[PDB]
Amino acid sequence: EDHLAKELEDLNKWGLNIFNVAGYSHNRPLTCIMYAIFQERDLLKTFRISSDTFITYMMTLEDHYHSDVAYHNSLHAADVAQSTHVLLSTPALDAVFTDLEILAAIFAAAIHDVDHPGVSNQFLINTNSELALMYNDESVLENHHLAVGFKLLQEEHCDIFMNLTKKQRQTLRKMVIDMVLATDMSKHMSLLADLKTMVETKKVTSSGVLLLDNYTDRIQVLRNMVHCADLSNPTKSLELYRQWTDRIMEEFFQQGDKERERGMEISPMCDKHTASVEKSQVGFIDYIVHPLWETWADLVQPDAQDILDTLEDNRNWYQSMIP
Numbered sequence: 410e411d412h413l414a415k416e417l418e419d420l421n422k423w424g425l426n427i428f429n430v431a432g433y434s435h436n437r438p439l440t441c442i443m444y445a446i447f448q449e450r451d452l453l454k455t456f457r458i459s460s461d462t463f464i465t466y467m468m469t470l471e472d473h474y475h476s477d478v479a480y481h482n483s484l485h486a487a488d489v490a491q492s493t494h495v496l497l498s499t500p501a502l503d504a505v506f507t508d509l510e511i512l513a514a515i516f517a518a519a520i521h522d523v524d525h526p527g528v529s530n531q532f533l534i535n536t537n538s539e540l541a542l543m544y545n546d547e548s549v550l551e552n553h554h555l556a557v558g559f560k561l562l563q564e565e566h567c568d569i570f571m572n573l574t575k576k577q578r579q580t581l582r583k584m585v586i587d588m589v590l591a592t593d594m595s596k597h598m599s600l601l602a603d604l605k606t607m608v609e610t611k612k613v614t615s616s617g618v619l620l621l622d623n624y625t626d627r628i629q630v631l632r633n634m635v636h637c638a639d640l641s642n643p644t645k646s647l648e649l650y651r652q653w654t655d656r657i658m659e660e661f662f663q664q665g666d667k668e669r670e671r672g673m674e675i676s677p678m679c680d681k682h683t684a685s686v687e688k689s690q691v692g693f694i695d696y697i698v699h700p701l702w703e704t705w706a707d708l709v710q711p712d713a714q715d716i717l718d719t720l721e722d723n724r725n726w727y728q729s730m731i732p
C-alpha cells in the first residue's frame with residue numbers, strides 16, 4: 410500500500426525497517442522483500458524465472474519458517490536477505506560478482522534458517538533428537554535448512570532455477586551449501602582468521618575496487634558476507650537492534666526453560682533467573698560482532714565506517730543500561 414511503498418524506497422539501504430515491511434505485507438516479509446530485491450536487481454529477467462513460480466516458491470519457503478519461534482522466523486530470513494542485498498552493492502565490491510553469485514547469496518540468505526525449531530545445535534545433540542542422529546552432530550541445523558530449501562525446488566510448480574544451465578545449477582548449489590554451512594557459529598573463529606588473512610593480502614584496482622582472482626576468493630567473501638548479515642542486528646539503528654534483542658532473548662530463555670524442565674544443565678545466557686540482557690549484548694558485540702565487522706570494514710574500507718560507528722554507539726547504549 411502507500412506505507413509499504415514508502416518503506417521499500419529504503420530497499421537498497423541499511424536503514425530499511427523490516428518490522429514495518431512485515432506489518433504491511435500480511436506478515437509475509439520474506440516473500441515481499443525477496444520479490445522487491447529480485448525486481449530491483451532484474452534477476453527474474455536475467456535467469457528467466459517465472460513470476461508466479463518465484464512467488465509460489467517464496468511463499469512456501471516462508472510458510473516453512475515457524476511463526477511461533479521468537480527470533481528464527483521469517484522476519485529474520487527477510488532481514489538477512491535484505492542486508493545481504495545491500496552488502497552486495499558495497500562500492501569496494503562493484504562488478505566483482507557474476508549475476509549467478511549474486512543470485513546464490515541472496516537465495517542462501519533467504520533459506521538459511523528455514524524450519525528452525527527455536528533450539529540450538531547443542532540442545533538437539535544433547536536430547537538425541539532425530540535431526541542430530543540424522544546429521545551425525547555436525548552442523549545439524551544448517552544442513553537441515555539447506556535440505557528443506559533445496560527439497561522445495563523439486564516440484565516443477567516451484568523450480569525457480571529450471572532455466573539455469575546444468576553447469577549453473579551445479580555451481581549455484583555448491584555456492585549456497587557453502588554459504589549456509591558457514592552460518593554455523595562453531596565455524597565463526599576460523600572464518601574470521603581466514604577473513605583476516607584475506608585482508609592482509611588485499612589487492613585493489615586503481616578505482617578502489619577489490620581484485621578477486623578465482624572462485625576460492627569470491628566464495629570466501631560471499632560466505633563472510635552472509636555471516637555478517639546474519640550477525641548484523643547490532644549494526645542497525647538502536648530502535649531495530651532492541652527489538653531483535655527482545656527476540657533473541659525470548660527464544661534463548663524458552664530453550665532455557667526446556668533445559669530446566671528436562672533437568673539438563675542450563676547454558677548461562679539461556680537462564681532467565683540470572684542472565685543480564687545488557688551485559689550479554691555488550692559481550693556479544695565485544696567478542697563476536699565487533700571483531701567481525703571491523704575486519705569486514707578493512708576489506709571494504711571506508712564503505713562500512715557508518716556501520717562501525719553505529720555499532721560502537723549501540724554498544725555504549727547497552728553498557729550505560731548496565732548498573
Ligand SMILES: COc1ccc(C(=O)Nc2c(Cl)cncc2Cl)cc1OC1CCCC1
Nearest residue numbers: 592594639640642653654657678689690693
Ligand atoms: C540481538 O542479539 C543476538 C542476535 C543474534 C545472535 C546469534 O547468536 N545468532 C546466531 C545464532 Cl543464534 C545461531 N547461529 C548463527 C547466528 Cl548469527 C545472538 C544475539 O545475542 C546474543 C545471544 C544472547 C546474548 C547475546
Ligand SMILES: [Mg+2]
Nearest residue numbers: 521522550592
Ligand atoms: Mg542459523
Ligand SMILES: [Zn+2]
Nearest residue numbers: 485521522639
Ligand atoms: Zn540466521
